[PDB]
Protein backbone atom coordinates (compact mmCIF):
# COMPACT_ATOMS: atom_id res chain seq x y z
CA UNK A 1 0.00 0.00 0.00
CA UNK A 2 2.83 2.32 0.81
CA UNK A 3 2.67 5.48 -1.76
CA UNK A 4 -0.24 4.03 -3.52
CA UNK A 5 -2.01 6.79 -5.03
CA UNK A 6 1.35 8.78 -5.58
CA UNK A 7 2.09 7.73 -9.21
CA UNK A 8 2.05 10.53 -10.70
CA UNK A 9 4.74 12.59 -8.61
CA UNK A 10 6.68 8.84 -8.08
CA UNK A 11 10.16 8.21 -9.24
CA UNK A 12 9.09 5.50 -10.74
CA UNK A 13 7.03 7.84 -12.68
CA UNK A 14 9.85 10.36 -13.12
CA UNK A 15 13.28 9.12 -13.39
CA UNK A 16 11.94 5.16 -14.87
CA UNK A 17 9.42 5.70 -17.68
CA UNK A 18 12.65 5.23 -20.24
CA UNK A 19 12.44 6.70 -23.93
CA UNK A 20 12.63 3.72 -26.27
CA UNK A 21 14.77 4.96 -28.99
CA UNK A 22 17.41 6.36 -25.97
CA UNK A 23 17.02 2.48 -24.92
CA UNK A 24 18.41 1.19 -27.99
CA UNK A 25 20.81 3.66 -28.29
CA UNK A 26 22.17 2.54 -24.92
CA UNK A 27 21.90 -1.39 -25.87
CA UNK A 28 24.07 -1.18 -28.93
CA UNK A 29 27.02 -1.79 -27.04
CA UNK A 30 26.03 -5.38 -25.98
CA UNK A 31 24.32 -5.47 -29.43
CA UNK A 32 28.12 -6.15 -30.67
CA UNK A 33 28.64 -9.77 -29.16
CA UNK A 34 24.66 -10.63 -29.24
CA UNK A 35 21.80 -10.20 -31.81
CA UNK A 36 18.52 -8.45 -31.25
CA UNK A 37 16.77 -11.80 -31.12
CA UNK A 38 19.36 -12.88 -28.99
CA UNK A 39 19.12 -9.99 -26.35
CA UNK A 40 15.87 -10.42 -25.76
CA UNK A 41 15.81 -14.23 -25.09
CA UNK A 42 18.72 -13.32 -22.44
CA UNK A 43 15.63 -11.03 -21.02
CA UNK A 44 13.88 -13.91 -21.00
CA UNK A 45 15.63 -16.21 -19.39
CA UNK A 46 16.83 -14.57 -16.78
CA UNK A 47 13.00 -12.86 -15.88
CA UNK A 48 12.59 -16.79 -15.35
CA UNK A 49 15.80 -17.41 -12.97
CA UNK A 50 14.08 -14.05 -10.91
CA UNK A 51 10.54 -16.14 -10.71
CA UNK A 52 12.53 -19.69 -9.62
CA UNK A 53 14.49 -17.91 -7.24
CA UNK A 54 11.13 -16.12 -6.17
CA UNK A 55 9.12 -19.07 -5.59
CA UNK A 56 11.66 -21.02 -3.57
CA UNK A 57 11.98 -18.63 -1.54
CA UNK A 58 8.49 -17.89 -0.74
CA UNK A 59 7.78 -14.68 -1.79
CA UNK A 60 4.36 -13.29 -3.41
CA UNK A 61 4.62 -12.22 -7.04
CA UNK A 62 5.24 -8.06 -6.23
CA UNK A 63 8.32 -8.54 -4.34
CA UNK A 64 9.38 -10.69 -7.35
CA UNK A 65 8.18 -8.17 -9.97
CA UNK A 66 10.06 -5.50 -7.94
CA UNK A 67 13.30 -7.65 -7.98
CA UNK A 68 12.55 -8.19 -11.73
CA UNK A 69 12.30 -4.32 -12.42
CA UNK A 70 15.23 -3.68 -10.50
CA UNK A 71 17.31 -5.86 -12.93
CA UNK A 72 16.19 -4.55 -15.95
CA UNK A 73 16.41 -1.01 -14.89
CA UNK A 74 20.22 -2.03 -14.13
CA UNK A 75 20.91 -3.37 -17.46
CA UNK A 76 19.18 -0.42 -19.45
CA UNK A 77 22.13 1.69 -18.01
CA UNK A 78 25.01 -0.35 -17.72
CA UNK A 79 26.72 -3.55 -19.89
CA UNK A 80 25.89 -7.03 -19.35
CA UNK A 81 29.94 -6.74 -18.92
CA UNK A 82 29.54 -4.57 -16.12
CA UNK A 83 28.50 -7.34 -13.33
CA UNK A 84 28.11 -10.77 -14.14
CA UNK A 85 23.81 -11.23 -14.41
CA UNK A 86 24.38 -14.82 -12.32
CA UNK A 87 25.25 -12.62 -9.26
CA UNK A 88 22.94 -9.66 -10.13
CA UNK A 89 19.68 -11.70 -9.85
CA UNK A 90 19.85 -13.16 -6.67
CA UNK A 91 21.01 -9.08 -5.35
CA UNK A 92 17.47 -7.98 -6.64
CA UNK A 93 15.50 -10.64 -5.27
CA UNK A 94 17.85 -9.82 -1.65
CA UNK A 95 17.26 -6.05 -2.21
CA UNK A 96 13.50 -5.62 -3.20
CA UNK A 97 12.97 -8.51 0.06
CA UNK A 98 14.23 -5.97 2.56
CA UNK A 99 11.76 -3.11 1.24
CA UNK A 100 8.77 -5.47 2.24
CA UNK A 101 8.15 -5.52 6.39
CA UNK A 102 6.79 -9.04 6.85
CA UNK A 103 9.33 -11.53 7.30
CA UNK A 104 12.75 -11.30 6.06
CA UNK A 105 15.45 -13.19 3.81
CA UNK A 106 18.39 -14.56 5.23
CA UNK A 107 22.19 -14.84 4.48
CA UNK A 108 22.29 -18.36 4.31
CA UNK A 109 18.79 -19.17 2.98
CA UNK A 110 19.33 -16.40 0.17
CA UNK A 111 22.95 -18.56 -0.91
CA UNK A 112 21.04 -22.04 -0.36
CA UNK A 113 18.23 -20.81 -3.04
CA UNK A 114 20.97 -18.88 -5.78
CA UNK A 115 22.91 -22.97 -5.52
CA UNK A 116 19.61 -25.18 -5.25
CA UNK A 117 17.85 -23.26 -7.93
CA UNK A 118 20.12 -22.92 -10.75
CA UNK A 119 21.49 -26.61 -9.85
CA UNK A 120 18.06 -28.46 -10.28
CA UNK A 121 15.96 -25.78 -12.35
CA UNK A 122 18.67 -24.61 -14.67
CA UNK A 123 21.38 -26.89 -15.70
CA UNK A 124 21.12 -26.86 -19.13
CA UNK A 125 22.21 -23.18 -18.81
CA UNK A 126 25.13 -23.76 -16.24
CA UNK A 127 27.80 -26.84 -15.61
CA UNK A 128 29.38 -25.36 -12.95
CA UNK A 129 27.61 -24.66 -9.42
CA UNK A 130 26.80 -21.36 -8.02
CA UNK A 131 30.55 -19.97 -7.23
CA UNK A 132 29.25 -16.66 -5.01
CA UNK A 133 29.68 -16.54 -1.38
CA UNK A 134 27.31 -14.12 1.03
CA UNK A 135 29.76 -11.21 0.94
CA UNK A 136 29.60 -10.74 -3.19
CA UNK A 137 25.57 -10.64 -3.00
CA UNK A 138 26.67 -7.72 -0.16
CA UNK A 139 28.98 -5.62 -2.81
CA UNK A 140 26.96 -6.07 -5.41
CA UNK A 141 23.88 -4.94 -3.10
CA UNK A 142 25.70 -1.31 -2.92
CA UNK A 143 26.29 -0.95 -6.67
CA UNK A 144 22.62 -1.93 -7.21
CA UNK A 145 21.30 0.71 -5.01
CA UNK A 146 23.71 3.37 -5.56
CA UNK A 147 23.23 3.00 -9.94
CA UNK A 148 19.18 3.19 -9.22
CA UNK A 149 19.66 6.28 -7.36
CA UNK A 150 18.24 5.20 -4.46
CA UNK A 151 14.81 4.67 -6.19
CA UNK A 152 12.98 1.61 -4.26
CA UNK A 153 9.29 2.02 -4.50
CA UNK A 154 8.14 0.27 -7.97
CA UNK A 155 4.38 0.70 -8.91
CA UNK A 156 3.00 -2.81 -10.94
CA UNK A 157 0.01 -4.06 -13.13
CA UNK A 158 -2.01 -6.24 -10.88
CA UNK A 159 -3.00 -3.91 -8.73
CA UNK A 160 -4.95 -1.79 -11.11
CA UNK A 161 -6.28 -5.26 -12.94
CA UNK A 162 -7.73 -6.01 -9.72
CA UNK A 163 -9.25 -2.98 -9.81
CA UNK A 164 -10.41 -2.80 -13.64
CA UNK A 165 -11.73 -6.63 -13.54
CA UNK A 166 -14.21 -5.75 -10.51
CA UNK A 167 -15.30 -2.97 -11.85
CA UNK A 168 -16.43 -5.72 -15.20
CA UNK A 169 -17.93 -7.90 -12.61
CA UNK A 170 -15.57 -10.99 -14.11
CA UNK A 171 -13.23 -11.87 -11.56
CA UNK A 172 -13.72 -15.97 -11.76
CA UNK A 173 -13.82 -15.52 -16.01
CA UNK A 174 -10.64 -13.14 -16.70
CA UNK A 175 -8.50 -12.22 -13.78
CA UNK A 176 -6.30 -15.47 -13.52
CA UNK A 177 -5.66 -15.03 -17.41
CA UNK A 178 -4.82 -11.72 -17.18
CA UNK A 179 -2.86 -11.76 -13.87
CA UNK A 180 -1.24 -14.42 -16.33
CA UNK A 181 -0.88 -12.19 -18.87
CA UNK A 182 0.99 -9.30 -16.71
CA UNK A 183 3.31 -12.14 -15.73
CA UNK A 184 4.26 -12.35 -18.79
CA UNK A 185 4.61 -8.58 -19.61
CA UNK A 186 7.81 -8.93 -17.41
CA UNK A 187 9.73 -10.83 -20.12
CA UNK A 188 9.49 -7.50 -22.13
CA UNK A 189 10.39 -4.04 -22.08
CA UNK A 190 6.84 -2.60 -21.06
CA UNK A 191 7.59 -1.99 -17.57
CA UNK A 192 10.26 0.68 -18.65
CA UNK A 193 7.77 2.73 -21.09
CA UNK A 194 4.47 2.79 -19.95
CA UNK A 195 2.97 3.10 -16.48
CA UNK A 196 1.49 0.15 -14.55
CA UNK A 197 -2.15 0.67 -15.73
CA UNK A 198 -1.78 0.66 -19.35
CA UNK A 199 -0.19 -2.60 -19.18
CA UNK A 200 -3.06 -3.67 -17.60
CA UNK A 201 -5.42 -2.53 -19.85
CA UNK A 202 -3.95 -4.32 -22.65
CA UNK A 203 -3.70 -7.70 -20.79
CA UNK A 204 -7.20 -7.84 -19.99
CA UNK A 205 -7.86 -6.46 -23.63
CA UNK A 206 -5.89 -9.78 -24.40
CA UNK A 207 -7.53 -12.40 -21.46
CA UNK A 208 -11.26 -10.96 -23.31
CA UNK A 209 -10.23 -11.67 -26.74
CA UNK A 210 -8.88 -15.23 -25.47
CA UNK A 211 -12.14 -15.88 -23.84
CA UNK A 212 -14.16 -13.90 -26.27
CA UNK A 213 -15.90 -11.56 -23.91
CA UNK A 214 -17.26 -8.31 -25.11
CA UNK A 215 -16.08 -5.67 -23.10
CA UNK A 216 -16.24 -2.94 -26.33
CA UNK A 217 -18.16 -0.46 -24.57
CA UNK A 218 -16.65 -1.20 -21.17
CA UNK A 219 -13.60 0.03 -22.85
CA UNK A 220 -14.84 2.77 -24.59
CA UNK A 221 -16.19 4.17 -21.02
CA UNK A 222 -12.87 5.19 -20.26
CA UNK A 223 -10.59 7.61 -21.08
CA UNK A 224 -7.22 6.35 -22.33
CA UNK A 225 -4.85 6.88 -25.01
CA UNK A 226 -5.94 3.52 -26.95
CA UNK A 227 -2.69 4.09 -29.46
CA UNK A 228 -0.69 3.79 -26.47
CA UNK A 229 -3.11 0.46 -25.55
CA UNK A 230 -2.61 -0.91 -28.46
CA UNK A 231 0.82 -0.83 -28.85
CA UNK A 232 1.64 -2.23 -25.80
CA UNK A 233 -1.04 -5.37 -27.53
CA UNK A 234 1.32 -5.79 -30.24
CA UNK A 235 4.30 -6.18 -27.96
CA UNK A 236 1.80 -9.35 -25.88
CA UNK A 237 1.12 -10.85 -29.14
CA UNK A 238 4.95 -10.28 -30.40
CA UNK A 239 6.12 -11.97 -27.54
CA UNK A 240 3.94 -15.16 -27.66
CA UNK A 241 5.66 -15.91 -31.16
CA UNK A 242 8.96 -15.80 -29.84
CA UNK A 243 8.28 -17.82 -27.06
CA UNK A 244 6.72 -20.28 -30.14
CA UNK A 245 9.90 -20.11 -31.52
CA UNK A 246 12.27 -19.96 -29.09
CA UNK A 247 13.39 -22.97 -27.24
CA UNK A 248 14.93 -22.05 -23.66
CA UNK A 249 16.67 -25.20 -22.80
CA UNK A 250 18.01 -25.87 -25.87
CA UNK A 251 19.74 -22.17 -26.88
CA UNK A 252 20.73 -20.53 -23.73
CA UNK A 253 23.84 -22.14 -22.99
CA UNK A 254 25.38 -20.97 -26.52
CA UNK A 255 23.71 -17.34 -25.84
CA UNK A 256 25.61 -17.17 -22.44
CA UNK A 257 28.49 -18.10 -24.10
CA UNK A 258 28.36 -15.12 -26.38
CA UNK A 259 27.81 -12.95 -23.42
CA UNK A 260 30.46 -10.20 -23.05
CA UNK A 261 32.40 -10.82 -20.09
CA UNK A 262 33.44 -8.87 -17.16
CA UNK A 263 37.40 -7.80 -17.55
CA UNK A 264 39.54 -8.57 -14.47
CA UNK A 265 42.55 -6.85 -13.50
CA UNK A 266 46.40 -7.38 -14.20
CA UNK B 1 36.07 -9.10 -7.40
CA UNK B 2 37.46 -11.00 -10.58
CA UNK B 3 34.29 -11.73 -12.28
CA UNK B 4 33.20 -7.76 -11.89
CA UNK B 5 33.93 -5.32 -14.92
CA UNK B 6 37.73 -3.74 -13.78
CA UNK B 7 36.85 -0.62 -16.39
CA UNK B 8 33.12 -0.25 -14.81
CA UNK B 9 34.38 -0.94 -10.93
CA UNK B 10 37.35 2.14 -11.89
CA UNK B 11 35.47 4.66 -13.71
CA UNK B 12 32.63 4.62 -10.55
CA UNK B 13 35.67 4.79 -8.18
CA UNK B 14 36.72 8.15 -9.47
CA UNK B 15 33.14 9.71 -10.45
CA UNK B 16 31.91 8.47 -6.93
CA UNK B 17 30.81 11.20 -4.34
CA UNK B 18 32.81 10.36 -0.93
CA UNK B 19 31.00 12.27 2.63
CA UNK B 20 34.25 13.21 3.78
CA UNK B 21 35.39 15.41 0.79
CA UNK B 22 31.91 16.78 -0.25
CA UNK B 23 30.77 17.62 4.00
CA UNK B 24 33.07 19.76 6.88
CA UNK B 25 31.21 17.72 10.00
CA UNK B 26 34.16 16.83 12.34
CA UNK B 27 33.39 17.29 16.03
CA UNK B 28 29.97 18.55 15.69
CA UNK B 29 27.90 15.56 16.07
CA UNK B 30 24.37 16.80 17.29
CA UNK B 31 22.93 12.91 17.73
CA UNK B 32 23.13 9.68 18.68
CA UNK B 33 20.94 7.07 19.61
CA UNK B 34 19.91 3.71 17.90
CA UNK B 35 19.32 5.20 14.52
CA UNK B 36 23.12 6.06 14.32
CA UNK B 37 25.04 9.24 14.58
CA UNK B 38 23.44 12.64 13.32
CA UNK B 39 26.28 15.70 12.80
CA UNK B 40 25.48 19.14 11.73
CA UNK B 41 27.40 20.17 8.79
CA UNK B 42 28.80 22.62 6.35
CA UNK B 43 29.21 22.48 2.15
CA UNK B 44 33.03 22.30 1.07
CA UNK B 45 32.66 23.02 -2.88
CA UNK B 46 30.54 25.94 -1.14
CA UNK B 47 27.50 27.08 -3.83
CA UNK B 48 25.70 27.42 -0.75
CA UNK B 49 25.97 28.66 2.83
CA UNK B 50 23.23 26.33 4.38
CA UNK B 51 23.98 24.08 7.10
CA UNK B 52 22.46 20.64 6.25
CA UNK B 53 21.78 16.68 8.69
CA UNK B 54 24.43 14.17 8.32
CA UNK B 55 22.67 10.88 9.92
CA UNK B 56 24.89 7.99 9.16
CA UNK B 57 23.24 4.79 10.41
CA UNK B 58 23.85 2.34 12.73
CA UNK B 59 25.35 -1.14 11.42
CA UNK B 60 27.04 -2.36 8.84
CA UNK B 61 25.26 -3.72 4.82
CA UNK B 62 21.22 -2.72 4.06
CA UNK B 63 19.26 -3.30 7.15
CA UNK B 64 15.60 -4.08 6.71
CA UNK B 65 15.40 -0.64 8.42
CA UNK B 66 17.65 1.69 6.31
CA UNK B 67 16.17 -0.07 3.29
CA UNK B 68 12.44 1.39 4.09
CA UNK B 69 14.06 4.81 5.21
CA UNK B 70 15.77 5.13 2.04
CA UNK B 71 12.72 3.62 -0.26
CA UNK B 72 10.08 5.87 1.39
CA UNK B 73 12.01 9.30 2.12
CA UNK B 74 13.01 8.70 -1.58
CA UNK B 75 9.34 9.63 -2.44
CA UNK B 76 8.38 11.46 0.33
CA UNK B 77 8.03 15.22 -0.51
CA UNK B 78 6.27 17.91 1.56
CA UNK B 79 7.33 21.27 3.59
CA UNK B 80 6.04 19.56 6.78
CA UNK B 81 8.15 16.08 6.34
CA UNK B 82 11.71 16.08 6.62
CA UNK B 83 13.16 15.96 3.25
CA UNK B 84 16.06 13.63 1.94
CA UNK B 85 18.70 15.38 0.24
CA UNK B 86 21.28 13.06 -0.83
CA UNK B 87 22.33 8.87 0.09
CA UNK B 88 25.90 8.38 0.23
CA UNK B 89 26.79 4.73 0.29
CA UNK B 90 30.87 3.87 1.47
CA UNK B 91 32.14 1.13 -0.34
CA UNK B 92 35.24 0.41 2.24
CA UNK B 93 33.36 0.93 6.19
CA UNK B 94 29.72 -0.77 4.65
CA UNK B 95 28.13 2.42 6.24
CA UNK B 96 25.01 4.80 4.64
CA UNK B 97 25.20 8.28 5.11
CA UNK B 98 21.82 10.27 4.14
CA UNK B 99 21.82 13.85 4.03
CA UNK B 100 18.76 16.17 5.03
CA UNK B 101 18.40 20.18 5.98
CA UNK B 102 19.43 21.42 9.09
CA UNK B 103 16.42 21.76 11.71
CA UNK B 104 17.83 24.15 14.76
CA UNK B 105 15.07 23.18 17.09
CA UNK B 106 12.64 20.45 18.25
CA UNK B 107 9.17 20.31 20.94
CA UNK B 108 10.95 18.20 23.26
CA UNK B 109 14.24 21.33 23.77
CA UNK B 110 11.22 23.88 23.15
CA UNK B 111 8.95 22.56 25.99
CA UNK B 112 11.86 22.50 28.36
CA UNK B 113 12.82 25.78 27.55
CA UNK B 114 9.42 26.99 28.82
CA UNK B 115 9.30 24.54 32.04
CA UNK B 116 13.02 26.19 32.79
CA UNK B 117 11.73 29.85 32.41
CA UNK B 118 8.50 29.82 33.54
CA UNK B 119 9.68 27.49 36.84
CA UNK B 120 11.72 30.38 38.19
CA UNK B 121 4.90 32.90 24.35
CA UNK B 122 3.86 34.15 20.57
CA UNK B 123 -0.05 34.05 20.37
CA UNK B 124 -0.98 31.06 18.09
CA UNK B 125 2.92 29.39 18.37
CA UNK B 126 0.74 26.44 19.62
CA UNK B 127 -1.97 26.73 17.38
CA UNK B 128 0.52 26.66 14.46
CA UNK B 129 2.64 23.59 15.62
CA UNK B 130 -0.39 21.97 16.64
CA UNK B 131 -1.86 22.37 12.33
CA UNK B 132 1.28 21.71 10.88
CA UNK B 133 2.09 18.18 12.75
CA UNK B 134 -1.56 17.40 11.30
CA UNK B 135 -0.42 18.44 7.52
CA UNK B 136 2.51 16.43 8.24
CA UNK B 137 1.06 13.16 9.22
CA UNK B 138 -2.02 13.83 7.16
CA UNK B 139 0.45 13.70 4.02
CA UNK B 140 1.71 10.27 5.48
CA UNK B 141 -1.50 8.40 6.34
CA UNK B 142 -2.57 9.28 2.78
CA UNK B 143 0.10 7.68 1.52
CA UNK B 144 -0.73 4.54 3.62
CA UNK B 145 2.53 5.42 5.80
CA UNK B 146 2.54 5.10 9.62
CA UNK B 147 5.03 6.93 11.73
CA UNK B 148 4.89 4.58 14.46
CA UNK B 149 7.01 6.50 17.16
CA UNK B 150 5.42 10.07 17.03
CA UNK B 151 6.75 12.24 20.23
CA UNK B 152 8.49 15.80 21.03
CA UNK B 153 12.03 15.05 20.48
CA UNK B 154 11.46 13.78 16.32
CA UNK B 155 8.69 16.81 15.65
CA UNK B 156 11.45 19.36 14.70
CA UNK B 157 11.06 22.89 13.66
CA UNK B 158 13.43 24.83 11.90
CA UNK B 159 15.56 27.68 12.90
CA UNK B 160 16.93 31.21 11.14
CA UNK B 161 17.09 30.94 7.52
CA UNK B 162 14.50 30.72 4.63
CA UNK B 163 12.31 27.98 6.48
CA UNK B 164 12.27 29.72 9.76
CA UNK B 165 9.51 28.65 11.55
CA UNK B 166 8.52 25.32 9.79
CA UNK B 167 7.40 22.26 11.46
CA UNK B 168 9.61 18.92 9.85
CA UNK B 169 7.99 15.20 10.76
CA UNK B 170 10.98 13.14 11.59
CA UNK B 171 12.43 9.68 12.22
CA UNK B 172 9.56 8.18 11.39
CA UNK B 173 9.19 4.55 12.55
CA UNK B 174 10.23 2.73 9.37
CA UNK B 175 10.79 -1.14 10.04
CA UNK B 176 8.53 -2.76 12.18
CA UNK B 177 8.44 -6.45 11.36
CA UNK B 178 4.67 -7.48 10.14
CA UNK B 179 3.95 -4.04 11.35
CA UNK B 180 3.56 -4.76 14.71
CA UNK B 181 4.48 -2.98 18.11
CA UNK B 182 5.11 -6.57 20.12
CA UNK B 183 8.42 -7.28 17.90
CA UNK B 184 8.92 6.20 27.28
CA UNK B 185 5.25 4.64 26.95
CA UNK B 186 4.01 8.35 27.42
CA UNK B 187 2.59 9.12 23.98
CA UNK B 188 1.07 5.11 23.21
CA UNK B 189 -2.39 5.02 22.85
CA UNK B 190 -4.54 2.48 25.40
CA UNK B 191 -4.65 -0.10 22.88
CA UNK B 192 -1.14 -0.46 22.72
CA UNK B 193 -0.89 -1.11 25.98
CA UNK B 194 -3.92 -3.45 26.26
CA UNK B 195 -2.17 -5.79 23.89
CA UNK B 196 -3.17 -4.69 19.98
CA UNK B 197 -1.31 -6.30 17.35
CA UNK B 198 -0.59 -3.76 15.12
CA UNK B 199 -0.08 -0.36 14.43
CA UNK B 200 -2.79 2.16 12.84
CA UNK B 201 -3.48 5.65 12.00
CA UNK B 202 -5.21 5.81 15.21
CA UNK B 203 -2.08 5.00 17.61
CA UNK B 204 -0.55 8.18 15.50
CA UNK B 205 -3.38 10.68 16.30
CA UNK B 206 -3.59 9.47 20.06
CA UNK B 207 0.25 10.70 20.37
CA UNK B 208 -0.68 13.88 18.66
CA UNK B 209 -3.03 14.77 21.18
CA UNK B 210 -0.31 13.60 23.81
CA UNK B 211 1.87 16.36 22.43
CA UNK B 212 -1.21 18.74 21.88
CA UNK B 213 -2.00 18.78 25.99
CA UNK B 214 2.02 19.50 26.50
CA UNK B 215 2.14 21.94 24.16
CA UNK B 216 -0.46 23.90 26.67
CA UNK B 217 0.49 22.72 30.17
CA UNK B 218 4.35 22.45 29.56
CA UNK B 219 3.81 19.19 30.99
CA UNK B 220 3.20 15.30 29.76
CA UNK B 221 -0.06 14.64 29.77
CA UNK B 222 0.51 10.82 30.64
CA UNK B 223 3.59 11.45 32.21
CA UNK B 224 4.70 8.48 34.61
CA UNK B 225 7.86 6.78 36.60
CA UNK B 226 10.90 4.59 33.86
CA UNK B 227 8.82 -7.11 27.56
CA UNK B 228 5.20 -7.45 27.19
CA UNK B 229 2.96 -4.45 26.17
CA UNK B 230 0.50 -4.38 29.22
CA UNK B 231 2.22 -1.47 31.25
CA UNK B 232 -0.25 -1.37 34.85
CA UNK B 233 0.93 2.27 35.92
CA UNK B 234 0.47 3.71 32.44
CA UNK B 235 -2.56 2.67 32.31
CA UNK B 236 -3.36 4.09 35.87
CA UNK B 237 -2.17 7.49 34.46
CA UNK B 238 -4.33 7.98 31.91
CA UNK B 239 -7.33 6.58 34.11
CA UNK B 240 -6.42 9.15 36.40
CA UNK B 241 -6.62 11.96 33.43
CA UNK B 242 -9.43 10.49 31.26
CA UNK B 243 -11.09 8.48 34.03
CA UNK B 244 -12.00 4.75 33.49
CA UNK B 245 -14.24 4.08 30.52
CA UNK B 246 -17.30 2.90 30.24
CA UNK B 247 -19.01 0.09 27.75
CA UNK B 248 -20.60 2.76 25.52
CA UNK B 249 -17.37 4.24 25.47
CA UNK B 250 -15.43 2.20 23.91
CA UNK B 251 -17.45 -1.45 23.15
CA UNK B 252 -14.51 -3.42 21.24
CA UNK B 253 -12.39 -3.49 24.36
CA UNK B 254 -13.21 -6.51 25.08
CA UNK B 255 -12.29 -8.04 21.81
CA UNK B 256 -8.53 -6.55 23.39
CA UNK B 257 -6.33 -9.37 24.58
CA UNK B 258 -5.63 -7.34 27.64
CA UNK B 259 -8.72 -7.19 29.07
CA UNK B 260 -8.84 -9.51 31.41
CA UNK B 261 -5.93 -8.34 32.59
CA UNK B 262 -7.29 -5.06 33.16
CA UNK B 263 -10.64 -6.06 35.04
CA UNK B 264 -8.19 -7.71 37.20
CA UNK B 265 -6.04 -4.97 38.28
CA UNK B 266 -8.75 -2.23 37.93
CA UNK B 267 -11.67 -0.83 39.45
CA UNK B 268 -14.47 1.93 38.19
CA UNK B 269 -15.08 3.22 41.73
CA UNK B 270 -10.88 4.05 41.37
CA UNK B 271 -11.40 7.05 39.11
CA UNK B 272 -15.12 7.71 39.42
CA UNK B 273 -14.33 11.47 40.01
CA UNK B 274 -11.28 11.75 37.13
CA UNK B 275 -11.91 13.53 33.34
CA UNK B 276 -10.09 15.29 30.96
CA UNK B 277 -12.05 18.67 31.84
CA UNK B 278 -10.89 18.70 35.35
CA UNK B 279 -7.39 17.75 33.97
CA UNK B 280 -7.21 20.48 31.90
CA UNK B 281 -9.10 23.02 34.41
CA UNK B 282 -6.36 22.18 36.79
CA UNK B 283 -3.61 23.25 34.11
CA UNK B 284 -5.18 26.53 33.49
CA UNK B 285 -7.11 25.25 30.37
CA UNK B 286 -10.64 26.53 29.43
CA UNK B 287 -12.82 23.74 28.69
CA UNK B 288 -15.45 25.33 26.55
CA UNK B 289 -12.62 26.42 24.25
CA UNK B 290 -12.38 25.40 20.76
CA UNK B 291 -8.35 24.00 22.06
CA UNK B 292 -10.30 21.87 24.53
CA UNK B 293 -12.86 20.11 22.42
CA UNK B 294 -10.18 19.24 19.41
CA UNK B 295 -7.94 17.67 22.19
CA UNK B 296 -10.96 15.41 23.93
CA UNK B 297 -11.45 14.54 20.04
CA UNK B 298 -7.79 13.46 19.62
CA UNK B 299 -7.81 12.21 23.05
CA UNK B 300 -10.10 9.79 22.42
CA UNK B 301 -10.31 6.35 24.46
CA UNK B 302 -12.00 3.82 21.89
CA UNK B 303 -9.65 3.84 18.32
CA UNK B 304 -12.70 4.04 16.04
CA UNK B 305 -13.95 6.64 17.66
CA UNK B 306 -10.62 8.81 17.77
CA UNK B 307 -10.93 11.59 14.79
CA UNK B 308 -8.58 11.68 11.65
CA UNK B 309 -6.03 14.21 10.85
CA UNK B 310 -8.29 15.65 7.88
CA UNK B 311 -10.79 16.08 10.52
CA UNK B 312 -8.72 17.65 12.72
CA UNK B 313 -7.17 20.09 10.27
CA UNK B 314 -10.78 21.04 9.53
CA UNK B 315 -12.16 21.86 13.14
CA UNK B 316 -12.90 25.33 13.43
CA UNK B 317 -10.37 26.08 16.23
CA UNK B 318 -8.14 26.80 12.82
CA UNK B 319 -10.60 29.77 11.97
CA UNK B 320 -10.61 31.00 15.24
CA UNK B 321 -8.38 33.78 16.01
CA UNK B 322 -5.28 33.64 15.78
CA UNK B 323 -4.99 31.60 12.59
CA UNK B 324 -2.21 29.62 11.97
CA UNK B 325 1.23 30.78 10.74
CA UNK B 326 3.29 29.44 8.10
CA UNK B 327 6.38 30.69 10.82
CA UNK B 328 5.38 29.40 13.69
CA UNK B 329 7.23 31.95 15.30
CA UNK B 330 5.60 34.59 13.61
CA UNK B 331 8.43 36.88 13.12
CA UNK B 332 9.20 37.30 16.59
CA UNK B 333 12.49 36.43 17.66
CA UNK B 334 13.24 32.62 18.43
CA UNK B 335 14.91 32.68 22.41
CA UNK B 336 16.18 29.27 22.12
CA UNK B 337 19.68 27.79 21.94
CA UNK B 338 21.38 26.85 19.44
CA UNK B 339 22.23 22.78 19.59
CA UNK B 340 24.94 21.31 21.61
CA UNK B 341 27.54 19.20 20.26
CA UNK B 342 28.77 15.64 21.37
CA UNK B 343 31.47 13.91 21.24
CA UNK B 344 32.84 10.64 19.99
CA UNK B 345 33.46 9.04 23.16
C1 LIG C 1 17.60 10.42 14.19
N1 LIG C 1 17.76 11.75 13.62
C2 LIG C 1 17.19 12.07 12.43
O1 LIG C 1 16.51 11.26 11.82
C3 LIG C 1 17.36 13.45 11.90
C4 LIG C 1 17.19 13.70 10.52
C5 LIG C 1 17.34 14.98 10.06
C6 LIG C 1 17.65 16.01 10.98
C7 LIG C 1 17.82 17.34 10.57
N2 LIG C 1 18.11 18.29 11.44
C8 LIG C 1 18.26 18.04 12.73
C9 LIG C 1 18.13 16.76 13.25
C10 LIG C 1 18.29 16.52 14.69
C11 LIG C 1 19.49 16.76 15.35
C12 LIG C 1 19.58 16.52 16.71
C13 LIG C 1 18.47 16.02 17.45
C14 LIG C 1 17.29 15.80 16.76
C15 LIG C 1 17.20 16.04 15.41
C16 LIG C 1 16.17 15.27 17.63
S1 LIG C 1 16.98 15.18 19.26
O2 LIG C 1 17.18 13.83 19.62
O3 LIG C 1 16.44 16.18 20.10
N3 LIG C 1 18.48 15.74 18.84
C17 LIG C 1 19.60 15.91 19.77
C18 LIG C 1 17.81 15.69 12.35
N4 LIG C 1 17.66 14.43 12.75
Known sequence: ?266 | DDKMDYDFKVKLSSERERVEDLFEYEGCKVGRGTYGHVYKAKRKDGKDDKDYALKQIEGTGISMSACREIALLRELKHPNVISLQKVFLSHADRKVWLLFDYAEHDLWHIIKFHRASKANLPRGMVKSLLYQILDGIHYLHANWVLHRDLKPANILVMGEGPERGRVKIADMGFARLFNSPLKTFWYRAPELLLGARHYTKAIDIWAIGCIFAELLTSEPIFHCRQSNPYHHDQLDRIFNVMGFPADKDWEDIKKMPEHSTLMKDFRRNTYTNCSLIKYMEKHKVKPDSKAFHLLQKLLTMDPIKRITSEQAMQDPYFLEDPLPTSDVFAGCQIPYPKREFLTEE
Open chain 1, 1 to 266: KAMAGNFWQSSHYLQWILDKQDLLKERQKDLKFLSEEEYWKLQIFFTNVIQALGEHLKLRQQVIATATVYFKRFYARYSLKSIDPVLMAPTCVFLASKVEEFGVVSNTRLIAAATSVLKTRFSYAFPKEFPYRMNHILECEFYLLELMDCCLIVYHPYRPLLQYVQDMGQEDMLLPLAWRIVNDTYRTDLCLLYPPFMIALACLHVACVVQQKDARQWFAELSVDMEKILEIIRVILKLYEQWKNFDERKEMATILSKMPKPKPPP
